Amino acid sequence: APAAVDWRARGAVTAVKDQGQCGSCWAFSAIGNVECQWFLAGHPLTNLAEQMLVSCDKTDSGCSGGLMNNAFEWIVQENNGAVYTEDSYPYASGEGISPPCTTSGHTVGATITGHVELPQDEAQIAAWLAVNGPVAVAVDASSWMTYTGGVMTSCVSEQLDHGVLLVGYNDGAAVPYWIIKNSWTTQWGEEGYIRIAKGSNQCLVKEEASSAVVG
Numbered sequence: 001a002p003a004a005v006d007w008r009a010r011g012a013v014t015a016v017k018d019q020g021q022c023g024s025c026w027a028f029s030a031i032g033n034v035e036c037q038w039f040l041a042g043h044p045l046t047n048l049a050e051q052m053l054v055s056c057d058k059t060d061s062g063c064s065g066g067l068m069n070n071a072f073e074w075i076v077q078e079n080n081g082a083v084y085t086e087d088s089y090p091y092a093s094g095e096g097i098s099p100p101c102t103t104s105g106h107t108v109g110a111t112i113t114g115h116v117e118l119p120q121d122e123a124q125i126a127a128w129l130a131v132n133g134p135v136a137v138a139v140d141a142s143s144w145m146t147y148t149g150g151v152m153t154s155c156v157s158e159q160l161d162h163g164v165l166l167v168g169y170n171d172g173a174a175v176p177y178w179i180i181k182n183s184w185t186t187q188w189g190e191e192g193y194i195r196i197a198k199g200s201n202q203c204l205v206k207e208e209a210s211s212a213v214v215g
């Protein structure tokens, strides 16, 4: 694979968002991945609606959590592949309460046909990401609250508790790293991003990687 990749260099990644006090990280991880995959299939970059998942995907648990893989499955099996625009279905769960689903009057921003669950191996995930784009991952983020910047070497790596988006890596750096988009505003971390050391399963990053498939 290339020594380094950063999909932000192509304009493939939307701006950092804010999940607020809702346990909706699963939705931000899944939607961020769909946004990037939609752009990379040769279509324009479009902000898509976490709130569609939080309120309407009844196979997940709203502000009480979910699974990116369930989200991808709901989109295909229950929503005809469709993902609405953020522009047409804005986030409304910042206080921790998910409002009931609105089915009407949103606008379709993207479609997907399925998803893949990637091998539990950082080199294999990197190789897939280098060609196919950003990848949704679960991590242990219990040690992340106080992170401000640099390449994390000390991640507490015990229990998956958070969903984020891998957008790149750099194997040529003094400490090789992953580049991860979070959903905790641009005030957190490196303008909303974190770098973690690559190659030692930091934060359990290899354990539950997946992506939407766009035709």
Ligand SMILES: *CC(=O)[C@H](CCCC)n1cc([C@@](C)(NCc2ccc3ncccc3c2)C(C)C)nn1
Pocket (backbone or CB within 6 Å): 022, 023, 024, 025, 026, 059, 060, 061, 063, 064, 065, 066, 067, 068, 070, 138, 139, 160, 161, 162, 163
């Ligand atoms: C990150 C975040 O906002 C929440 C924290 C918990 C909610 C207060 N989060 C964590 C997850 C993970 C770990 N999945 C847990 C989970 C919760 C509910 C649920 N419902 C149905 C099926 C499966 C579920 C799993 C996720 C990052 C892998 N999700 N939200």
